[PDB]
């Protein structure tokens, strides 16, 4: 019968690892680097686009940075199509919570839910896992600014600064070197771009290659603003920090 052709995606190796999760992580290690840095007065999300072509319409393009609600955003590393399936689920979960409790969903609850979906694909159903790692940048009134990551295993953890995708080993060493707890958003912006500039496989870091975003509690009158940077604005912040 059909048994013959079954890869068996949800089994342990003799060493106690999940084959498909490990291979999905290998897939993600080739994806464009995404960095999240959390400051006292905000969060930075920086990410490197993978497919440099001059003919790519950049201003209408979105492969890395997605909005989940007004308070929470994600940076993606891996298969974009897989990420979009999960993103739309997370967008619905946030609105279900808002409908039920009449309050914006706490960041960790949203993260756990997505992470639980990913976990399910590793334990049952016989389907391949999602080849996606997220960096979640968000704010709520309990814990304030939060950074998380999730990976295809469905394990998630909290961070002050973190990278996913390509050259994370190199990137995490550089962040660990220059990060400090009293840091501010403007400093974190500079750290994120400097880290990408050194770890990038490209010859030089330019505006047409980057997606960039900030979550600040520096909106008018103590609200939280999500800013997804336009191409010209990425070009300006590259000149300001002194990279181009």
């Amino acid at each position: 019968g059909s048994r013959r052709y079954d890869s068996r995606t949800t089994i342990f190796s003799p060493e106690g690892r999940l084959y498909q999760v490990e291979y999905a992580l290998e897939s993600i290690s080739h994806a464009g680097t995404a960095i999240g840095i959390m400051a006292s007065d905000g969060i930075v999300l920086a990410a490197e686009r993978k497919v440099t072509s001059t003919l790519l319409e950049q201003d209408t393009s979105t492969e890395k940075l997605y909005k989940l609600n007004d308070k929470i955003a994600v940076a993606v590393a891996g298969l974009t199509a897989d990420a979009e399936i999960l993103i739309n689920t997370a967008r619905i979960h946030a609105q279900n919570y808002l409908k039920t409790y009449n309050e914006d969903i706490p960041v960790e609850i949203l993260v756990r839910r997505l992470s639980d979906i990913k976990q399910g694909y590793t334990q049952h159903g016989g389907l391949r896992p999602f080849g996606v790692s997220f960096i979640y940048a968000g704010y709520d009134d309990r814990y304030g600014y939060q950074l998380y990551t999730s990976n295809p295993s469905g394990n998630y953890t909290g961070w002050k600064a973190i990278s996913v995708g390509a050259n994370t080993s190199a990137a995490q060493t550089l962040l660990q070197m220059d990060y400090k707890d009293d840091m501010k958003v403007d400093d974190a912006i500079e750290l994120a771009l400097k880290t990408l500039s050194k770890t990038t496989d490209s010859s030089a870091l330019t505006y047409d290659r980057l997606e960039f975003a900030t979550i600040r509690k520096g909106a008018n009158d103590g609200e939280v603003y999500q800013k997804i940077f336009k191409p010209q604005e990425i070009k300006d912040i590259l000149v300001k920090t002194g990279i181009t």
Binding site: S2, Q20, A24, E26, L55, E57, L79, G125
Partner: protein, 250 residues
């Protein structure tokens, strides 16, 4: 008499490759060249009508398809896979959008729905990926003109101009030299015909080329009068005669 294939046929190999997606992309590479160019006042999509026999009536085989009145599609790769995607794309535009909001979806969201269908064939049980790359050109009120590419993975990217299939590497280089942000629609059609001539071996005329535009509203093609707001479809497939006219000024 059971469907026992409830498990993924596309899986990660040790190197992190999704084999079936890569192989689907190889099938797209073998397919006939198609291209898309975006102008200031329009978009053009074009491909070669590679006729399998001269007895076959190549007019009956439509490689360039209307999805909505303001959105069109063209492909490279496996034709049958494309045909069923067009059927699903037309239907999803109604079920998940028009029947809710009373208007056709914008280009990016219809593309998103097609992408989703293609992604599901890359993860669901007992199916292979679609062996096509699509180029979807369209217009909507708030985004203006746009051109999208959709791959077997479900990934999609917006383009100013691009090409897919057989001679795409050479064609994309040709388009990089010629494209600028001040192109009129007629200039883009002219560039499309020049680019497409390089990848075509045999006959090069209106009968062997399929070409459509997303341009101005066509109230003449609407079929009715009496509603000022409905001004007619922006999608228009160029006739065999209309192509030949522009090939004289080539």
């Amino acid at each position: 008499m059971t469907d026992r294939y409830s498990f993924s046929l596309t899986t990660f190999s040790p190197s992190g490759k999704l084999g079936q997606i890569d192989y689907a992309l190889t099938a797209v590479k073998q397919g006939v060249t198609s291209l898309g160019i975006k102008a200031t006042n329009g978009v053009v999509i074009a491909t070669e009508k590679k006729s399998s026999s001269p007895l076959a009536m190549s007019e009956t085989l439509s490689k360039v398809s209307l999805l909505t009145p303001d959105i069109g599609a063209v492909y490279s790769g496996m034709g049958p896979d494309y045909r069923v995607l067009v059927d699903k794309s037309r239907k999803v535009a109604h079920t998940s959008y028009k029947r809710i909001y009373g208007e056709y979806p914008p280009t990016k969201l219809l593309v998103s729905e097609v992408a989703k269908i293609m992604q599901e064939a890359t993860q669901s049980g007992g199916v292979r990926p679609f062996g096509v790359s699509l180029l979807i050109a369209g217009h909507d009120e708030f985004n203006g003109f746009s051109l999208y590419q959709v791959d077997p993975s479900g990934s999609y990217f917006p383009w100013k101009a691009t090409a897919i299939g057989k001679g795409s590497v050479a064609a994309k280089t040709f388009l990089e030299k010629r494209w600028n942000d001040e192109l009129e629609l007629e200039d883009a059609i002219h560039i499309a015909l020049l680019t497409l001539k390089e990848s075509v071996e045999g006959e090069f005329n209106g009968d062997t080329i399929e070409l459509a535009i997303i341009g101005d509203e066509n109230p003449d093609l609407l079929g009715y009068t009496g509603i000022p707001t409905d001004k007619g479809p922006r999608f228009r497939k160029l006739t065999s005669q209309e192509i030949n006219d522009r090939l004289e000024a080539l």
